[PDB]
Structure 1
Amino acid sequence: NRRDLRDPDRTVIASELVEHSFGVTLDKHVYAALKFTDEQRTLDIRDYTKQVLMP
């Protein structure tokens, strides 16, 4: 703040140090779910790593 020099009154204006805040949160659950009927697991799938895990 600024005040006139040699002003007969001597009051000064205070300043408040106001701190603000904001929140960060976890809100999503990203997933990939695969169900294999036992027939598909036994016969169709021939290389689990290359054919299921990588996709």
Structure 2
Amino acid sequence: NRRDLRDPDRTVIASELVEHSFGVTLDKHVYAALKFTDEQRTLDIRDYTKQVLMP
């Protein structure tokens, strides 16, 4: 604040300190799902890793 010097009005204006906040939330569930029949896993998949997991 600010006041004149040698001023007969000698009151001081008090200041204020206000803190703030904001909230972070978990809200989503990302996923990738696959399904393979027994025949598809026996006679169709050669390398499980590079053919299923990596994609």
When normalised by structure 2's length, the TM-score is 0.89
What SS does the corresponding residue of 2:43 show, helix, strand or coil?
Answer: helix
Q: Give the corresponding residue for 1:15.
A: 15
Identity of aligned residues (%): 100
Could you say what the CA RMSD is over the residues aligned between the two structures, in angstroms? 0.9
Deviation at 1:22, TM superposition (A): 0.2
- Cα deviations by residue, 1:17-43 (Å, 9 ceiling, x for unpaired): 100000011111111111111121111
Large movers: runs of 4+ above 2 Å: none
Deviation at 1:45, TM superposition (A): 0.7
Gaps of 5+ in 2: none
